[PDB]
Every structure is written in structure tokens, then in C-alpha cells.
Amino acid sequence: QVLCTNPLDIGELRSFKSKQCVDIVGNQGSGNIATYDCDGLSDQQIIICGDGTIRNEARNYCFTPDGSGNANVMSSPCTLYPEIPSSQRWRQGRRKTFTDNGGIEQVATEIINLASGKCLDIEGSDGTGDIGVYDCQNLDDQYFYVRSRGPELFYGRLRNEKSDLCLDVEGSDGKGNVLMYSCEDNLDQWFRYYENGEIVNAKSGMCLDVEGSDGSGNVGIYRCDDLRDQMWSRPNAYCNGDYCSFLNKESNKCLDVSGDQGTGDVGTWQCDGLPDQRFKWVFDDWEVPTATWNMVGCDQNGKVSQQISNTISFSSTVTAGVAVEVSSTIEKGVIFAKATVSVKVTASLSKAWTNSQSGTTAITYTCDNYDSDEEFTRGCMWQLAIETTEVKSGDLLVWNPQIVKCTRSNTAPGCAPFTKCANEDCTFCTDI
Ligand SMILES: CO[C@H]1O[C@H](CO)[C@H](O)[C@H](O)[C@H]1O
Ligand SMILES: CO[C@H]1O[C@H](CO)[C@H](O)[C@H](O)[C@H]1O
Ligand SMILES: CO[C@H]1O[C@H](CO)[C@H](O)[C@H](O)[C@H]1O
Ligand SMILES: CO[C@H]1O[C@H](CO)[C@H](O)[C@H](O)[C@H]1O
Ligand SMILES: CO[C@H]1O[C@H](CO)[C@H](O)[C@H](O)[C@H]1O
Ligand SMILES: [Ca+2]
Ligand SMILES: [Ca+2]
Ligand SMILES: [Ca+2]
Ligand SMILES: [Ca+2]
Ligand SMILES: [Ca+2]
Ligand SMILES: [Mg+2]
Ligand SMILES: [Mg+2]
């Protein structure tokens, strides 16, 4: 009945060993956990909760050992009352850092069960197969990273310099062949471009891909596979103002339109410096969002319990189009107490925003512990507010997600959302 209100990170949880995703069977967010190909579905968006639980965006279920000893791990109902049991709580152990093939620094850690002290584990040694708990053995297949794409660099539709047409996916489900088409106010034409080189379709969550593996061929949308032929550079040398070429990292060929009129099928071709090989990002300006905490309630002589709703205020309906613009804006950068936040904060916040769009879900939430972990005996409950302005109109948007910090202080938490209060009064932070 109660979602995770103090999340620390949201994204794919990956094996340090194989780089495969930690996967719940099917797409509903319940059932056995094992490694699988990363597939872009919401059940693979794992939520690292500040309360120790590990949940997912498909359903409010918890990573749960099916018994004592070296047991199987599955996604099962979370036990919240009288308290979350230590068997459904996990801590990060030892850490391993590495740079992935997209050039992004990742941080892997052991994931340790609080009841048993056993490690989240993949069968055998190769980092593929069934997932459960086992004695910690220091091996790579007991280390897991929440995947970072690096910074979101650019976003929007992609308009060809020659034709004024937009980069398009056939149909409207964001799947299949990419070609030029009339610019349309549909998600299947909206793309988000990351430091890891991925260009991601907003409708399908899938990647701008070249057929086969050599980076020379027809371009379409396919399962993000982390391969070099789905990585793209946007080098300054090829930019003319805001119109730039996109070079495939596998073949060094340019994102290209058939012929020279900017009107046909899209593939990769030898770069030629012609206008049909340049594209501009088309998007509305929104102000860098700001994060603040609002007091929901205080109790100096015990716990505080409140109704916590997801609310959004704006000048008009937050359309699917407005929602992807805001998501993209958030991921690009957010300010907290006049400082930027880390890549995982903006990535997680934008994922929370997206998941917030179809309800939600007013909840009765109680401050049982301080965000810093100690038992809550007095203080205040604080709810996040995210604010931004659409520059063209001057219209302010305010989002109050179901994201809460419990602290001992009447002073607002000193920590960004998706970071952990280090002390009861929350004056400094960890897990930033
Ligand atoms: C056929 O795929 C389905 O089940 C597998 C496990 O077999 C994965 O969980 C995948 O995400 C889900 O869509
Ligand atoms: C028999 O040991 C093997 O399987 C267990 C789980 O059964 C663990 O994955 C362990 O690391 C692996 O060496
Ligand atoms: C009937 O048009 C449909 O397919 C074309 C491609 O032929 C475009 O992708 C358009 O967005 C879609 O509605
Ligand atoms: C059959 O798979 C191959 O082609 C598809 C396009 O059909 C993708 O590019 C994939 O990466 C590649 O391995
Ligand atoms: C035969 O060349 C023509 O088509 C190819 C793709 O087939 C490229 O678009 C190239 O720029 C164009 O001159
Ligand atoms: Ca799945
Ligand atoms: Ca193992
Ligand atoms: Ca289309
Ligand atoms: Ca491919
Ligand atoms: Ca061409
Ligand atoms: Mg399992
Ligand atoms: Mg194509």
C-alpha cells in the first residue's frame, strides 16, 4: 500500500560480471529474479530504496529471499507492518569502479541481505543465470551497478537541414524503420541523446540502431544492446551552428538520408558534408529545474503521519508532449541549494517524473525512521517540490512527487532528493 518515498536511485541494475540486467520474469514486476538481456521495460527499472528495500517501477514489490540459508531471490509483496523485516532489506557492501564500453564510469557494489549477511548472487561464476543469496565470495558476479548513461546531452526532434523534415519512426509505436517525415507532435519523433552515445526513442525506449553490427546500413529502432553501432558522436567539426552530423562509432559513417534532398529513407553512409547529413535538435526552452523541500507536518512528541499525494500544477494539461519535454529538461540538470546534482539524481528524478504521469495514488505515510536510519521519535516530514518555467510562455510548472524526507529538524533537509541524510537533522549527505 506504500511505495518507496525515499528512493536513492532508479535504473537498470546490472551484473558487474556479464553486464546483463537483473530481471524479474515477465513484465508485471513479480516472480523469479535472474539475469536477462536489458529490454527497456519498467520492471527492469529497479528502485534502490532508502529504507533498505529494492523495488521496481512495474509494481510495488520487493527483492525477497524465499527462505533462510542460500535461498532463491524473487520479487514478492513488501512486508511493511509492523515493520519492514531485515530479510527484505539490503545494504551496499564493497565497491568496484569501472568504465563501460560507452565510456561511462560505473560503480558496482555487493548487495548484502540484512537478515542473513548473504550476498545477492548469480549461479556459478559467469554472471548469467538464476539469482539468489549466497555467502559473499568477493567474485565479480556478486557485484551490481545501477547503470548510468552519463549526462543527457541533447533532446527533442531532429530536423534535417536540407528538407526541414524530421527524423521519424514508421507508424507511431516508435518501433522499426527510421526515415524522414513531416514533423509531428508525437513521441515517436522525440529523441534523447546521452554521453554513452545512445540516441533513445521516447515512445519505445529503444535505440537508434544500424542493421547488423558493422555500423553501415539501414537505420531503425532496435533493442538497446550497448554495442558500438548504437553509439553516435556529434563532433564540433561537423556542426554548422546548431545543425550537426551524427557519426556512428562502429563505422565512422554519417547518419544519412537517401540521395541528396533530405526526403527518403535513413541509413548510414560515408560522410560528405552535405546538408542532408546535418540535423538540429528541436525543443522548447524550459528553465533548469529547482528542487526544494516543503514541510508536511511535525510532531515533537512522536511520529508524524500524513497523506502524501503526487500533484502537478501548470497553466494547461500536462500532455504526453509536455511530459516528455519536462522529463528531458529534468535529466539535463537540476539545481538544489544553488548547486548542481549528480548524474544519478537527475536520471532518477526524470524517471520518477515519467512514472508519475498515470496515477498515483494518495498514500498514508508514517515517519518510522529518520532518513538517516535511526528511529523517529520527533521532528518533521518533508515533501519534494520541483519547479520549472516554460520560457516561451513564462508559465511555471510545479511538481510535488510522493518523495519524502523524515528528519529531526524544523529546518529543511540539506540534501538533494536521491541522496541520503547523513544525520538525524539532515545537515549533510551521503550517496550523492
Ligand atoms: C519473454 O520475455 C519476458 O520474460 C523474460 C524472462 O523469460 C524477461 O523477464 C522479459 O523481460 C519478459 O518480457
Ligand atoms: C556451487 O557454487 C556455485 O553456485 C552457487 C549458487 O548455487 C553460487 O552462485 C556460487 O558462487 C557458485 O560458485
Ligand atoms: C501513415 O503515416 C504513418 O507512417 C508514416 C511513415 O510512412 C509516418 O511515420 C507517420 O508518422 C505515421 O502516422
Ligand atoms: C538481426 O539482428 C541484427 O539486425 C537488427 C536490425 O534488424 C539489429 O541491428 C541488431 O543489432 C543486429 O544484430
Ligand atoms: C547512391 O548515393 C546516394 O544514396 C546514398 C545512400 O544509398 C547516400 O544517401 C548518398 O549521400 C547519395 O548520394
Ligand atoms: Ca522482465
Ligand atoms: Ca556465483
Ligand atoms: Ca511516425
Ligand atoms: Ca545493430
Ligand atoms: Ca545522402
Ligand atoms: Mg531467483
Ligand atoms: Mg531507415
From Swiss-Prot:
Changing I403A: No effect on oligomerization. No effect on lactose binding. Changing I330A: No effect on oligomerization. No effect on lactose binding. Residues 1-294 are annotated as: Has hemagglutinating activity towards rabbit erythrocytes, but no hemolytic activity towards them. May have potential as a tool for controlled permeabilization of cell membranes. The C-terminal part (342-361) of this protein may be used to generate mutant peptides having increased antibacterial effect. This protein may also be used for the generation of mosquitoes that are refractory to all species of human Plasmodium. SUPFAM superfamilies: Hemolytic lectin CEL-III, C-terminal domain, Ricin B-like lectins. Mg(2+) 2 binds at N177, V178, N218, V219, D265, V266. Binds 5 calcium ions per subunit. Binds 2 magnesium ions per subunit. Magnesium is probably occupied in place of calcium as excess magnesium is used in the experiments. Mg(2+) 1 binds at N32, I33, N72, V73, I131. GO terms for cellular component: extracellular space; Golgi apparatus. Ca(2+) 2 binds at D121, I122, G124, D141. GO terms for molecular function: calcium ion binding; fucose binding; galactose binding; lactose binding; magnesium ion binding; melibiose binding; N-acetylgalactosamine binding; polypeptide N-acetylgalactosaminyltransferase activity. Optimum temperature for hemolytic activity is 10 degrees Celsius. Hemolytic activity decreases markedly with increasing temperature. Binds to lactose between 5-40 degrees Celsius, with maximal binding around 10 degrees Celsius. Pore formation in artificial liposomes containing human erythrocyte membrane lipids lactosyl ceramide (LacCer) or globotetraosylceramide (Gb4Cer) increases with increasing temperature. Cytotoxic effect on African green monkey kidney (Vero) and Madin-Darby canine kidney (MDCK) cell lines increases with decreasing temperature. Ca(2+) 1 binds at D23, I24, G26, D43. The modification Pyrrolidone carboxylic acid is found at Q1. Ca(2+) 3 binds at D168, V169, G171, D188. One of its GO terms (biological process) is defense response to Gram-positive bacterium. Its main location: secreted. This is Galactose/N-acetylgalactosamine-binding lectin CEL-III. The gene is cel3.
